[PDB]
Design an enzyme around this catalytic site. Structure first.
Site, mmCIF file in Angstrom:
data_model
loop_
_atom_site.group_PDB
_atom_site.id
_atom_site.type_symbol
_atom_site.label_atom_id
_atom_site.label_comp_id
_atom_site.label_asym_id
_atom_site.label_seq_id
_atom_site.Cartn_x
_atom_site.Cartn_y
_atom_site.Cartn_z
ATOM 1 N N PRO A 34 2.787 -5.071 5.301
ATOM 2 C CA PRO A 34 1.980 -5.782 4.300
ATOM 3 C C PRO A 34 0.510 -5.479 4.525
ATOM 4 O O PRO A 34 -0.023 -5.729 5.609
ATOM 5 C CB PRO A 34 2.300 -7.260 4.563
ATOM 6 N N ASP A 35 -0.137 -4.912 3.514
ATOM 7 C CA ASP A 35 -1.578 -4.700 3.593
ATOM 8 C C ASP A 35 -2.237 -6.074 3.557
ATOM 9 O O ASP A 35 -2.426 -6.668 2.493
ATOM 10 C CB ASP A 35 -2.055 -3.790 2.468
ATOM 11 N N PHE A 36 -2.590 -6.569 4.747
ATOM 12 C CA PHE A 36 -2.838 -7.983 5.024
ATOM 13 C C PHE A 36 -3.978 -8.593 4.215
ATOM 14 O O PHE A 36 -4.130 -9.820 4.234
ATOM 15 C CB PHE A 36 -3.126 -8.155 6.520
ATOM 16 N N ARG A 37 -4.782 -7.787 3.517
ATOM 17 C CA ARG A 37 -5.907 -8.350 2.776
ATOM 18 C C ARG A 37 -5.438 -9.212 1.607
ATOM 19 O O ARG A 37 -6.160 -10.124 1.185
ATOM 20 C CB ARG A 37 -6.820 -7.228 2.281
ATOM 21 N N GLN A 107 -6.183 6.857 9.919
ATOM 22 C CA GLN A 107 -6.820 5.564 10.158
ATOM 23 C C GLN A 107 -5.831 4.470 10.543
ATOM 24 O O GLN A 107 -6.263 3.358 10.877
ATOM 25 C CB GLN A 107 -7.569 5.102 8.908
ATOM 26 N N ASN A 108 -4.530 4.741 10.465
ATOM 27 C CA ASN A 108 -3.532 3.702 10.665
ATOM 28 C C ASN A 108 -3.314 3.460 12.145
ATOM 29 O O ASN A 108 -3.529 4.344 12.984
ATOM 30 C CB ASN A 108 -2.202 4.077 10.001
ATOM 31 N N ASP A 110 -0.287 1.768 13.012
ATOM 32 C CA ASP A 110 1.130 1.403 13.073
ATOM 33 C C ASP A 110 1.970 2.366 13.912
ATOM 34 O O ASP A 110 3.166 2.110 14.103
ATOM 35 C CB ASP A 110 1.720 1.298 11.655
ATOM 36 N N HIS A 127 -8.575 5.602 14.450
ATOM 37 C CA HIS A 127 -8.952 4.211 14.665
ATOM 38 C C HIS A 127 -8.149 3.574 15.785
ATOM 39 O O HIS A 127 -8.027 2.344 15.840
ATOM 40 C CB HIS A 127 -8.835 3.395 13.374
ATOM 41 N N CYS A 135 -9.395 -3.871 29.548
ATOM 42 C CA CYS A 135 -9.974 -5.191 29.797
ATOM 43 C C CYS A 135 -11.385 -5.260 29.226
ATOM 44 O O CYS A 135 -12.233 -4.413 29.524
ATOM 45 C CB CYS A 135 -10.012 -5.523 31.285
ATOM 46 N N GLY A 198 -3.328 8.394 0.434
ATOM 47 C CA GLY A 198 -3.259 6.951 0.613
ATOM 48 C C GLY A 198 -4.380 6.322 1.421
ATOM 49 O O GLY A 198 -4.132 5.620 2.408
ATOM 50 N N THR A 199 -5.624 6.583 1.033
ATOM 51 C CA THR A 199 -6.761 5.929 1.667
ATOM 52 C C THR A 199 -7.843 5.705 0.624
ATOM 53 O O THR A 199 -8.023 6.524 -0.284
ATOM 54 C CB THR A 199 -7.313 6.751 2.853
ATOM 55 N N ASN A 223 -3.257 9.658 -4.276
ATOM 56 C CA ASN A 223 -3.788 8.315 -4.106
ATOM 57 C C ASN A 223 -3.758 7.616 -5.458
ATOM 58 O O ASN A 223 -3.699 8.267 -6.502
ATOM 59 C CB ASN A 223 -5.218 8.366 -3.562
ATOM 60 N N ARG A 224 -3.825 6.284 -5.427
ATOM 61 C CA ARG A 224 -3.878 5.529 -6.679
ATOM 62 C C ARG A 224 -5.093 5.925 -7.516
ATOM 63 O O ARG A 224 -4.962 6.242 -8.703
ATOM 64 C CB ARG A 224 -3.875 4.029 -6.396
#
Ligand SMILES: [Zn+2]
Lengths: 273, 7
Positions: A34-37, A107-108, A110, A127, A135, A198-199, A223-224
């Protein structure tokens, strides 16, 4: 000028040999991450109990030290095995198996690029990764397995030497990117094809890598929408395949002649998992 | 940018 079919013929004719790929959160939404935004999912509800002023605070250091529990809720959800790679990941795996992948920049966080079988040497997890942690106080490194039990028990992991919070090596806003990110200095001049999947290209310095290929190199965006420097500084050999990411990948795979091979690979890999 | 930042 150039079409998706034009790009496929460049590969089929071996006119392009060294493909660099950039990917983001859009390639993993079909896996069910789920794209948490957006407020739809159950992970969103687990975060709604917390102090979160906005979604991106989960990747900001001042909020993290104020309250690390939202970030570790996400860490628990992305635990290896919860999610599997999808067709877009295996397209990139097959791209590597066919000798075309110079480097995949992601950038993922997962871990699905590695799960799909892309070797670490071909990957730049730009990322960061849950494979290791540090630590926040004494800077001791730890393998990601060392904090697993705490994370799965909803306990904030602490350092066994100084009791500082132990933070997975995810790149937060304001933090440097990993050392392997430096490979972009040689990878992008060497590419003869750039693929962007997809970014939204809204985070630097990752987004500006699109400008680092040579002027003659085609840039194919699946991409969309048209985003980032590809919208503001378009080049003559840019190709935009706008729509669902998996449908654009399926279209390219068919034009390359890879459809049956890709389905065989997905069948066998998903079963191994 | 040399650190991760919103564009
Ligand atoms: Zn420590």
């Amino acid at each position: 000028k150039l079409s998706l079919q034009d790009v496929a013929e460049l590969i089929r004719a071996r006119a392009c040999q060294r493909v660099v790929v950039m990917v983001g959160a859009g390639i993993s939404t079909p896996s069910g991450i789920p794209d948490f935004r957006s407020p739809g999912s159950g992970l969103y509800s687990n975060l709604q109990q917390y102090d979160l002023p906005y979604p991106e605070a989960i990747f900001e250091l001042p909020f993290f030290f104020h309250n690390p529990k939202p970030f570790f809720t996400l860490a628990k959800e992305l635990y290896p095995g919860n999610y599997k790679p999808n067709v877009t990941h295996y397209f990139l795996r097959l791209l590597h198996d066919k000798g075309l992948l110079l480097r995949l920049y992601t950038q993922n966080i997962d871990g699905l690029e590695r799960v799909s079988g892309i070797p670490a040497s071909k990957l730049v997890e730009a990322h960061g990764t849950f494979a290791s942690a540090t630590c926040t106080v004494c800077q001791r490194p730890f393998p990601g397995e060392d904090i697993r039990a705490d994370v799965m028990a909803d306990r904030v992991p602490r350092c066994p030497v100084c009791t500082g919070v132990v933070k997975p090596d995810i790149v937060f806003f304001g933090e440097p990117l990993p050392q392997r990110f430096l490979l972009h200095v040689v990878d992008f001049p060497m590419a003869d094809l750039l693929l962007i999947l997809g970014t939204s290209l809204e985070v630097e310095p990752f987004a500006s890598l699109t400008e680092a290929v040579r002027s003659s190199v085609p840039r194919l965006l699946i991409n969309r929408d048209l985003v980032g420097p590809l919208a503001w500084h378009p080049r003559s050999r840019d190709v935009a395949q706008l729509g669902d990411v998996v449908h654009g990948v399926e279209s390219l795979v068919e034009l390359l002649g890879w459809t049956e091979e890709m389905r065989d690979l997905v069948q066998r890999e998903t079963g191994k998992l | 940018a040399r650190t991760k930042q919103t564009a």
